[PDB]
C-alpha cells in the first residue's frame, strides 16, 4: 500500500503488476484525511470467503451474473482491498424491516 | 430434472393467482363437459361448480411451481392451504 503526497509517476505505477501474485494497492493522502467509510450513508461491507461466496450461490440459487454487482473503485472495495469475484455481504437497515442481507460481486 | 416434494421453500399457502387459475381451469373444463368430482348441489354455473370443487378439495389439479434458476416443486390443490 503506497501513500503518496501529490501523485506517483505513470513510469513508476507500471511497476505495480510486476510482482505477482502479490497485489500493489495505491491511495493518495487526500481521501484518507477523512474516513470515507465511517459515513452515515454507507452500511457495513463484508469480505466473503471462497466457501461463503459459493454457499451464497448454492442456497440463494444465483449465478456469477444474477448478483447485484459492485464497482472495484468503490471507496469500500479499496478500503477492504477487494479484488474481482469477491462477495460483499452488506447489512443495510429498512424503514419496514430493520435489517436486510444484500450481496455484491466485485468487478 | 426437477426437485422433490420434501424441500419446499415455496409458501405452503395457495397464491391468489393459483386460486384464479385452478378455479378457472375447472371453470373451463367443467363448461367443456368435463367430469365433475363434486356432487352438483343445485349448482349449474361452470365457474361456480369449480368453486364448490375447491371447497370439497377434490380437484385433481397439481401446480408446477418453477424456480427462476430452472428446477421445480409440485403441490396438489389438496396440498395447498387456502387462507386466501
Amino acid at each position: 500500500i503506497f501513500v503518496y503526497q501529490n501523485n506517483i509517476t505513470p513510469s513508476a505505477m507500471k511497476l505495480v503488476p510486476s510482482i505477482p501474485p502479490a497485489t500493489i494497492e495505491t491511495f493518495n493522502e487526500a481521501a484518507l484525511v477523512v474516513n470515507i467509510t465511517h459515513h452515515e450513508l454507507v452500511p457495513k461491507h463484508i469480505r466473503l470467503s471462497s466457501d461463503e461466496k459459493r454457499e451464497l450461490l448454492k442456497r440463494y440459487r444465483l449465478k456469477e451474473s444474477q448478483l447485484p454487482r459492485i464497482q472495484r473503485a468503490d471507496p469500500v472495495a479499496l478500503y477492504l482491498g477487494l479484488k474481482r469475484g469477491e462477495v460483499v455481504k452488506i447489512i443495510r437497515k429498512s424503514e419496514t424491516s430493520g435489517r436486510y442481507a444484500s450481496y455484491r460481486i466485485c468487478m | 430434472k426437477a426437485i422433490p416434494k420434501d424441500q419446499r421453500a415455496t409458501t405452503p399457502y395457495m397464491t391468489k393467482y393459483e386460486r384464479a387459475r385452478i378455479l378457472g381451469t375447472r371453470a373451463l373444463q367443467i363448461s367443456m363437459n368435463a367430469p365433475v368430482f363434486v356432487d352438483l348441489e343445485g349448482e349449474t354455473d361452470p365457474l361456480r361448480i369449480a368453486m364448490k370443487e375447491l371447497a370439497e378439495k377434490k380437484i385433481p389439479l397439481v401446480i408446477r411451481r418453477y424456480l427462476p434458476d430452472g428446477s421445480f416443486e409440485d403441490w396438489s390443490v389438496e396440498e395447498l392451504i387456502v387462507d386466501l
Partner: protein
C-alpha cells in the same frame, strides 16, 4: 384463430434466434423468380406474370394459386420471393460495422491487424461480451493501420513472429452515404472502397477473427452484411388495394421494389453489353440507392427520395418505428374485439362492484357459453329471441364451427342444439367485464365490474368508485371488454374485482372514498344537533338492504320518540368493528363533538366525515376491509350511500351568493388588513430608496425588497381571508362543505369573500414588460403593491380592470405547465414501467425478472403484500428509560415491582421466585435490546411506521370478543406469557428455507415486526394494562400468526410494474433553501443528471459543538469561495519605470513604509472596497501574501495596509511587457482564489432543529448549526475541521456514491426521491421506490431510466426494442446473431402468449393418481 385445421403439431415460441439472411439461402427459400416490374396483369389482361406479383408468391382477387399452398386469402400466409442484385449493395444499416470491420481486418488477406501479440488486444479477445469484444478490438485495431508481416514475441524483442503475412497499410474509412472513402500516403490517395471490393475481404476474414468480433458462421456472417440477393416480400406486406375492379392499388413498397427492378435491369444492360464503366457506377449507385431507400428513406442521407407525390415512400424502418409503428401500436398495443366506449353518469343505487350497461350495448356484446346440460335449456330460449329481446343470441356455433347467424337463418327458431356447441349469448345481468377510464397508468385504473343492464344510453357507476378511475361526470368516456374464456372471466373475478382493490397497495391506504353529497350528508346527519321522527326513521332503516328488520331503541323517548342522526347511521355499520380516533378538541366527552368512537358497529360520539367515511389509512373504510372483509366492505359503501342520500334528499342542500358575503364589519376589517400591509410595503419602498436596506446572505438588494414586500402582502392575504373564515357561521353552506371536506379549502374563502393576492409568472411578481413600468396605464418605475400584480378585491366585490389583467397572466402560466408536465410525466410513466416490467416476486421469495438477476433478496426488504400493511406504532422507542421501566419491567423479587394478585391468579406466589425472575430478565432485557435497536434504525424517535398485522386491532377485538372483566385477575402464569411469544416468534415466516442464509436474511426480514410484537405482548403490559385470559391471549397470538402468513407477498405479483404504477401515476398530479420543485427534480434523478439545475451541499457541524453559533461563523468564510474579483473595485496599469520611487502620489508614501522594512517598469495598481474586504473579513496582508504565494518568484508585491484609506496592492514582475502585464490581470481576478473551497458559493447559516434523546431518555429537540450551501464539490469539503464527515449530505447523488461507496449511492438516490414524494406531500410505501432505486444500483453504479441504461443492457432483443429505439435495436440483434430468452413480459407479449405473470407463472397438471381417487 387462423381458420381451418392442420395436422401440424401446435406449440410455444421458445427462442427467436435472430440472424442474417445468407444471400445463398435467400435464393433457395424462394418459390418465385421475380424478374420484371409488370406486377399483375399480362398487358391489362387481368392476371399476373413472372414479375412483381405472383410469379409464384400469392394471388389477389379472392383466389387460391399460391404455389400449391393456395389456402384462399386467410390461412394463406405470405410467400417470399427473391431478386439477384446486379452488383453487391451496402445494406443501409449494417453500413456501420462495414466501415468498422474494415478498419480492423487487413484489406488484403482477411486477417485482423492486431492479434495475440498485443496485450490489450488479448485483454479484448478475452472479453466474453459479443459486441464489447468488438468494442475493444475496434478501438484497438483501428489504431495500428499497418498489418505486421513480422512483430516481436511476448518473451524477447530481438525474437520476432512472422504470424500473418502482408505489411500493407489500412485506409482512413469515412462515410459518403453509399460508398466508403479510404486513404494511404507520398501525397494522399483515397480509394473508392466499393461494395464488390469490400465484400471480397469480408469473405476471406478468418472464422476465429469474425468470431472474435460480433459475428457467426451459422446465423449471421459479415459476408452477408453486403447483399447480392434481395428477398422479395409477399403481397400481404405490400397489398393490392384495387378500386372496384379495373383499377390498381399497390402499396408504396411495391413501387420501390419496381424502382429497384428497373435499377437492376439498368445495371444489367450496361454490364452484359457495351460497358460504360464510370456510368455503370450510376446504375450501381441507384440500385445501391433504391435497395438502401426501400428499407430506409427517413435517414441522414439528405434525399428522403420522394416518390412522385412528394411522399418519402413507406420505409420498412418507418413501418416498425414507435407508437402505431407495429411494435408500439400494432403489437404492444392493439384495437380489440368485444369492446364498448360510452358517456358516464353518477349512481346512488349501484354497489361499488356494479356497472351501468345500456340495453343496446348488452344486445351488441356477445359471450360464448358452451352447450352443457347446466345451461343448454336456457341457451335454447336465448336461441329463440335472437338480437331484439334483451336476453338472446347473435350466432350459434356448431360442434364443427359453422356460424348459425340467428339473425337471418331459416332454422333460426328450430335450432336443435347439441352439446359441445357454443351459443353466442348476449352479455347479461351480474356478468364480469373490464371497465376502464383512460389513461391506464394505474393497476386500479383498469378494474372489473358486474353488468346491470339499464335503459338510457350511458355507462353509469357507483359514486365511490369516482376516485380510483379518475372520474368526473362531465361526460367522461370509458371502455369495456367482454371476456370469452370461462378461465378469463375467472381472471377478472379473482384479481380485478373492485371490492379487492378497496385497499391501495400503491400507498398502504384505501383508494375508494365516499364523495360530495355522501361526504356532506353523513356529517350533516352525524351531529348531536340532528334528529329524526319514527315515520322518516322507518323509511331510513328499511333502506338498508341487509337490515335485521329490528327497530332500534330511540335514544330519546321523552315528549317525542326521537332518533339521533348517529343511532340510525350505526345501523349500516357492521357489528364487530372497533374504531378509536381522537383529536385536539376531543376529551371523550368531546365538547366539539370531535374525534371518532365506534365500539362494535355503533357510533358513540364524534362526527363522521373524511376522517372516517373518507379514503384514509385510519378511515372506517380501511378498518372494515381488514377487520371484516372485501365484498363485505364494498357492500358498506352502498348501504351508507343509499341511506345518507335518502336523508340528504329530504334535508336538502344549496350554495348561493349568500355564502360569499361575510358579516358587515368583517368585510371592512379586510380592507384594514390589506391597508396595514400596504403601509408595510411603503416602509421597504422608502428604506430601499435611501439604500438603508440590509440585504440578506445570497441576495441582491433589488431582490431583498421584493422578497420581503411579497411576505407582508401574502401574510395579510392569508389573515384577510381568515377573518371571513370563522366569521361565516356554522350555517354557512360553503363552510359546511369544507367542514366534512366534501369540496373546497380556506384559500377559496379568501379569494371569494376577502382578497385575491399576488399573481406571478416563473415566481416573478408581474414585472415591467415595458420600460421600468408594468402596463402603459402605469408610471415609469412603479414597484407598488398593485403595480407588480397584487389584488386587494375578492371575486365577490368584482376585480378592477387592472386587478383583472394581472389575474390573466398569472393564470396563463397555470395552463401552459399543465400541457407541458402532463406530457413529460407521460414519458416518465413509460420509462419507469418499461424498466420495471419483467421484475416481480418469485418462489425463492426473491425479486428477479427476464433473466433471474436479483434486485432484493426478500421483496420490500421485509417480504409483505403492500396493502396488508397499516401504519403501526413501536412503543419501545418512546419515553424516558424510566417511563419504559414502569410500563415494562416486571421484578417478582421486589414488593414494589411485583404484579399484584389483582393482575394474575399467581401474583401472590409468583413473587420471590428465582427462575421466574430469571425468565423476566430475558423479557425486559430483550425490550432494552429492542429499545436501542429501533433507536439505531431511526434516531428521530418516530414510531408511526408502515408495519403489517395491526396488533392494536386484534387486541381491540379481543377485549370485546372475550368480555374480559378488568375487575378480577387474569389466569395466565409468567411462564405462559414470556414463552407464548417466544414460540409465536418462530411460526411468523417469510423465506421458508432450511439452511443458513435463507434462515438468516429471514430473521433480518421480520426484525422490526418482532420488536413491535415484543412491545405489545410484554408480560406487564399484558396483565397490568390488558388483563386478558390465557384464552384471549391465545386468540391474540393465533390471530396475529395467520394474519401475518396472509401478509406474505404472493409469488408472481408484478411488484416491478406495480412500483412504477405507484410512482408514475401520482407524478402526474404534481402542480410545481431553494431546489427543483418535484416534477423537473424527478426527470433529473430518473434521467440521472450530473448537470444539476439546483446543486446544494448541506453540512452539519462537528459532533461536539452542535449549538455553537461561532463555529459556523468560522467554517462559513473558510468554505465560501472568495475571489480577487469580489474584493476589487478597479485594476489599473501605470508606467512606473523605477522600482523604489513611485510617480503615483496616491501611493507616494505607502511604498516608503513596506519597502525600507532588476524589478519591472510596468506597475499593476488595484483599488479594493473596504466593505467587500471586511465582508469575508480581510487584511491587505492576507491578500498580499495570497498573491505573493500565487505567482511566487517572478512577481513581487507591495501594498497599503488596513490603516491606510487608499486600499491599494501594487505589483510588478522581473523586451516587451505592455501586453504581458495586461495578460496577468486576467488570470489574477478569475483564478486567484482567496478564501474557501472553489465552486461552493453562497454559504448561508441555519439553526437546524435536531432530535436527540435527553439525559433522561426522553426524545428531545436540539437547535444545532448547519451550513446549507449553493455549491457541490465534496471531494475536499468533507476533509474540514468544523464539520461532521458522517452527516455531510449533498443534492448531487452522483457526488455521494462517487466518494462514499455504491450502497450509500442507493441511499442518496432514495432520500433524493422520498423528498419528491413530499414535493406533493403524498405517500408511497418505501418498497416501490426502494425497488427502482435498487434498479439503477444493482448494475454496479448509476444507470438512467432511458435507452442507454435499461434498454441497452442484458435483456432479450425484444424487451428493449419495445421502447425508444426499435428497428435500430433489432438491427444489432440480426448482425450479432442475437437471441431472445422468451422469459420477460415483452417477449411473450409479442407472441400473444401467457407470459410468466401471476396466473401465467406456474403450470397446472393432473395427477392420474389424485384424479382416480375421486369416484
Amino acid at each position: 384463430v387462423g381458420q381451418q385445421y392442420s395436422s401440424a403439431p401446435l406449440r410455444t415460441v421458445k427462442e427467436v434466434q435472430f440472424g442474417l439472411f445468407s444471400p445463398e439461402e435467400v435464393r433457395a427459400i424462394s418459390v418465385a423468380k421475380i424478374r420484371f416490374p409488370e406486377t399483375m396483369d399480362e398487358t391489362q389482361t387481368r392476371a399476373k406474370i413472372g414479375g412483381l406479383n405472383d410469379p409464384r408468391l400469392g394471388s389477389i382477387d379472392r383466389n387460391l394459386k399460391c404455389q400449391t399452398c393456395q389456402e384462399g386469402m386467410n390461412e394463406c400466409p405470405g410467400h417470399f420471393g427473391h431478386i439477384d442484385l446486379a452488383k453487391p449493395v451496402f445494406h443501409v444499416g449494417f453500413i456501420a460495422k462495414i466501415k468498422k470491420v474494415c478498419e480492423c481486418v487487413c484489406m488484403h488477406c482477411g486477417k485482423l491487424l492486431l492479434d495475440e501479440h498485443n496485450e490489450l488486444m488479448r485483454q479484448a479477445l478475452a472479453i466474453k461480451d459479443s459486441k464489447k469484444r468488438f468494442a475493444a478490438i475496434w478501438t484497438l485495431c483501428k489504431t495500428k493501420m499497418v498489418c505486421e508481416t513480422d512483430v516481436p514475441s511476448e518473451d524477447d524483442p530481438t525474437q520476432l513472429v512472422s504470424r500473418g503475412g502482408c505489411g500493407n497499410t489500412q485506409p482512413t474509412i469515412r462515410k459518403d452515404g453509399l460508398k466508403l472513402v479510404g486513404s494511404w500516403k507520398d501525397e494522399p490517395e483515397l480509394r473508392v472502397l466499393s461494395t464488390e471490393e469490400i465484400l471480397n475481404i469480408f469473405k476471406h476474414i478468418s472464422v476465429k477473427d469474425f468470431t472474435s468480433l460480433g459475428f457467426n458462421e451459422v446465423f449471421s456472417r459479415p459476408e452477408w452484411m453486403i447483399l447480392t440477393c434481395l428477398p422479395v416480400p409477399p403481397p400481404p406486406v405490400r397489398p393490392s388495394i384495387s378500386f372496384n375492379e379495373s383499377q390498381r392499388g399497390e402499396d408504396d413498397l411495391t413501387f420501390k421494389l419496381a424502382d429497384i427492378l428497373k435499377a437492376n435491369i439498368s445495371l444489367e444492360t450496361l454490364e452484359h453489353n457495351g460497358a460504360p464503366h464510370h456510368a455503370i457506377e450510376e446504375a450501381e449507385s441507384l440500385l445501391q440507392f433504391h435497395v438502401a431507400t426501400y428499407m430506409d428513406n427517413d435517414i441522414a442521407g439528405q434525399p428522403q427520395a420522394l416518390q412522385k407525390s412528394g411522399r418519402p415512400v413507406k420505409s420498412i424502418r418507418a413501418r416498425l418505428k414507435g407508437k402505431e409503428g407495429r411494435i408500439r401500436g400494432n403489437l404492444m398495443g392493439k384495437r380489440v374485439d368485444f369492446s364498448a366506449r360510452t358517456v358516464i353518469s353518477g349512481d346512488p343505487n349501484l354497489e361499488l362492484d356494479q356497472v351501468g350497461v345500456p340495453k343496446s350495448i348488452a344486445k351488441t356484446l356477445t359471450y360464448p357459453e358452451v352447450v352443457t346440460p347446466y345451461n343448454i335449456d336456457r341457451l335454447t330460449q336465448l336461441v329463440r329471441n335472437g338480437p331484439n329481446e334483451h336476453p338472446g343470441a347473435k350466432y350459434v356455433i356448431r360442434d364443427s364451427g359453422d356460424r348459425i347467424d340467428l339473425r337471418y337463418s331459416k332454422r333460426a327458431g328450430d335450432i336443435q342444439l347439441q352439446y359441445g356447441w357454443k351459443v353466442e349469448r348476449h352479455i347479461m345481468d351480474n356478468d364480469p367485464v373490464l371497465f376502464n377510464r383512460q389513461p391506464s397508468l394505474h393497476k386500479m385504473s383498469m378494474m372489473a365490474h358486474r353488468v346491470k343492464v339499464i335503459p338510457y344510453s350511458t355507462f353509469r357507476l357507483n359514486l365511490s368508485v369516482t376516485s380510483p378511475y379518475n372520474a368526473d361526470f362531465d361526460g367522461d368516456e370509458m371502455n369495456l371488454h367482454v371476456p370469452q374464456s370461462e378461465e378469463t372471466r375467472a381472471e377478472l373475478s379473482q384479481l380485478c374485482a373492485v371490492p379487492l382493490q378497496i385497499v391501495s397497495p400503491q400507498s398502504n391506504k384505501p383508494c375508494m372514498g365516499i364523495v360530495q353529497d355522501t361526504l356532506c350528508g353523513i356529517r350533516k346527519l352525524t351531529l348531536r344537533d340532528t334528529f329524526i321522527e319514527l315515520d322518516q326513521v322507518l323509511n331510513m332503516l328499511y333502506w338498508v338492504p341487509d337490515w335485521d328488520g329490528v327497530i332500534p331503541t330511540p335514544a330519546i323517548i321523552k315528549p317525542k320518540p326521537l332518533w339521533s342522526g348517529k343511532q340510525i347511521l350505526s345501523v349500516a355499520i357492521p357489528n364487530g368493528i372497533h374504531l378509536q380516533r381522537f383529536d385536539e378538541g376531543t376529551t371523550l366527552l368531546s365538547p366539539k363533538d370531535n374525534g371518532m368512537l365506534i365500539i362494535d358497529g355503533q357510533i358513540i360520539f364524534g362526527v363522521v366525515e373524511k376522517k372516517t367515511v373518507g379514503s384514509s389509512n385510519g378511515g372506517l373504510i380501511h378498518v372494515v376491509t381488514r377487520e371484516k372483509g372485501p365484498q363485505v366492505c364494498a357492500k358498506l359503501f352502498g348501504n351508507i350511500q343509499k341511506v345518507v342520500n335518502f336523508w340528504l334528499l329530504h334535508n336538502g342542500f344549496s350554495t348561493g351568493i349568500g355564502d360569499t358575503i361575510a358579516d358587515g364589519p368583517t368585510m371592512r376589517e379586510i380592507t384594514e388588513t390589506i391597508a396595514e400591509a400596504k403601509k408595510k410595503v411603503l416602509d421597504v419602498t422608502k428604506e430601499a430608496q435611501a439604500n438603508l436596506l440590509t440585504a440578506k446572505h445570497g441576495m441582491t438588494l433589488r431582490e431583498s425588497f421584493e422578497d420581503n414586500v411579497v411576505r407582508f402582502l401574502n401574510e395579510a392575504r392569508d389573515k384577510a381571508g381568515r377573518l371571513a373564515e370563522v366569521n361565516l357561521k356554522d350555517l354557512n353552506n360553503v363552510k359546511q362543505m369544507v367542514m366534512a371536506g366534501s369540496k373546497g379549502s380556506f384559500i377559496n374563502i379568501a379569494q371569494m369573500s376577502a382578497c385575491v393576492g399576488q399573481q406571478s409568472v416563473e415566481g416573478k411578481r408581474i414585472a415591467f414588460g415595458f420600460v421600468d413600468r408594468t402596463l402603459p396605464h402605469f408610471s415609469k418605475d412603479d414597484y407598488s403593491p398593485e403595480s407588480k400584480g397584487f389584488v386587494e378585491n375578492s371575486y365577490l366585490r368584482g376585480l378592477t380592470p387592472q386587478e383583472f389583467f394581472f389575474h390573466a397572466m398569472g393564470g396563463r402560466e397555470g395552463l401552459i405547465d399543465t400541457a407541458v408536465k402532463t406530457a413529460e410525466t407521460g414519458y416518465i410513466q413509460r420509462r419507469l414501467v418499461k424498466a420495471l416490467e419483467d421484475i416481480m416476486v418469485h418462489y425463492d421469495n426473491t425479486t428477479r425478472n427476464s433473466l433471474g438477476n436479483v434486485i432484493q433478496f426478500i421483496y420490500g426488504e421485509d417480504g409483505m403484500d403492500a396493502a396488508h400493511i397499516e401504519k403501526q406504532s413501536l412503543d419501545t422507542i418512546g419515553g424516558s428509560d424510566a417511563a419504559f421501566e414502569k410500563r415494562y419491567r416486571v421484578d417478582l423479587l421486589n414488593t414494589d415491582h411485583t404484579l399484584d394478585p389483582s393482575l394474575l391468579e399467581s401474583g401472590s406466589e409468583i413473587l420471590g421466585d428465582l427462575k421466574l425472575q430469571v425468565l423476566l430478565d430475558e423479557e425486559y432485557k430483550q425490550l432494552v435490546k429492542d429499545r436501542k435497536f429501533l433507536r439505531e434504525v431511526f434516531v428521530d424517535g418516530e414510531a408511526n411506521w408502515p408495519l403489517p398485522v395491526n396488533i392494536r386491532r386484534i387486541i381491540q377485538n379481543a377485549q370485546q370478543t372475550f368480555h374480559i372483566d378488568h375487575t378480577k385477575p387474569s389466569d395466565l402464569t409468567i411462564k405462559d406469557i414470556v414463552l407464548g411469544v417466544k414460540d409465536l416468534q418462530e411460526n411468523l415466516l417469510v423465506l421458508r428455507g432450511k439452511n443458513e442464509i435463507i434462515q438468516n436474511a429471514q430473521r433480518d426480514a421480520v426484525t422490526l415486526f418482532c420488536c413491535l410484537l415484543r412491545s405489545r405482548l410484554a408480560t406487564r403490559r399484558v396483565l397490568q394494562e390488558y388483563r386478558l385470559t390465557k384464552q384471549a391471549f391465545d386468540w391474540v397470538l393465533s390471530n396475529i400468526e395467520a394474519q401475518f402468513l396472509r401478509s406474505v407477498v404472493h409469488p408472481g405479483e408484478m411488484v416491478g410494474v406495480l412500483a412504477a404504477q405507484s410512482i408514475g401515476e401520482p407524478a402526474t398530479q404534481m402542480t410545481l433553501k431553494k431546489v427543483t420543485s418535484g416534477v423537473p427534480r424527478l426527470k433529473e434523478i430518473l434521467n440521472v443528471a450530473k448537470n444539476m439545475k439546483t446543486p446544494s451541499l448541506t453540512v452539519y457541524l462537528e459532533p461536539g459543538h452542535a449549538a455553537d453559533q461561532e463555529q459556523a461563523k468560522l467554517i462559513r468564510s473558510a468554505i465560501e469561495h472568495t475571489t480577487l474579483k469580489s474584493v476589487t473595485i478597479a485594476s489599473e496599469i501605470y508606467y512606473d519605470p523605477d522600482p523604489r520611487s513611485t510617480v503615483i502620489p496616491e501611493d507616494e508614501e505607502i511604498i516608503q513604509l513596506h519597502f525600507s522594512l532588476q524589478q519591472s517598469p510596468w506597475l499593476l495598481r488595484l483599488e479594493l472596497d473596504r466593505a467587500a474586504m471586511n465582508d469575508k473579513d480581510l487584511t491587505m496582508g492576507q491578500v498580499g501574501e495570497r498573491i505573493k504565494q500565487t505567482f511566487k518568484n517572478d512577481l513581487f508585491v507591495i501594498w497599503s495596509e488596513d490603516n491606510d484609506e487608499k486600499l491599494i496592492i501594487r505589483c510588478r514582475v522581473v523586451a516587451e511587457e505592455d501586453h504581458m502585464l495586461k495578460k496577468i490581470e486576467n488570470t489574477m481576478l478569475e483564478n486567484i482564489t482567496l478564501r474557501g473551497v472553489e465552486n461552493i458559493e453562497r454559504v448561508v447559516m441555519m439553526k437546524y432543529d435536531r432530535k436527540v434523546p435527553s439525559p433522561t431518555g426522553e426524545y428531545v429537540k436540539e437547535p444545532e448549526w448547519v451550513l446549507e450551501t449553493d455549491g457541490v464539490n465534496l471531494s475536499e469539503v468533507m476533509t474540514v475541521p468544523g464539520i461532521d464527515p458522517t452527516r455531510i449530505y449533498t443534492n448531487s447523488f452522483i457526488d455521494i456514491m462517487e466518494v462514499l461507496g455504491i450502497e450509500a449511492g442507493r441511499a442518496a438516490l432514495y432520500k433524493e426521491v422520498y423528498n419528491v414524494i413530499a414535493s406533493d406531500g403524498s405517500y408511497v410505501n418505501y418498497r416501490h421506490m426502494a425497488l427502482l432505486v435498487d434498479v439503477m444500483t444493482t448494475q454496479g453504479g448509476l444507470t438512467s431510466v432511458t435507452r442507454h441504461g435499461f434498454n441497452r443492457s442484458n435483456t432479450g432483443a425484444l424487451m428493449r426494442c419495445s421502447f425508444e429505439e426499435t428497428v435500430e435495436i433489432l438491427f444489432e440483434a440480426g448482425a450479432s446473431a442475437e437471441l431472445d430468452d422468451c422469459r420477460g413480459v415483452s417477449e411473450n407479449v409479442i407472441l400473444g402468449q401467457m407470459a410468466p405473470i401471476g396466473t401465467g407463472a406456474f403450470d397446472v397438471m393432473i395427477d392420474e393418481e389424485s384424479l382416480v381417487k375421486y369416484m
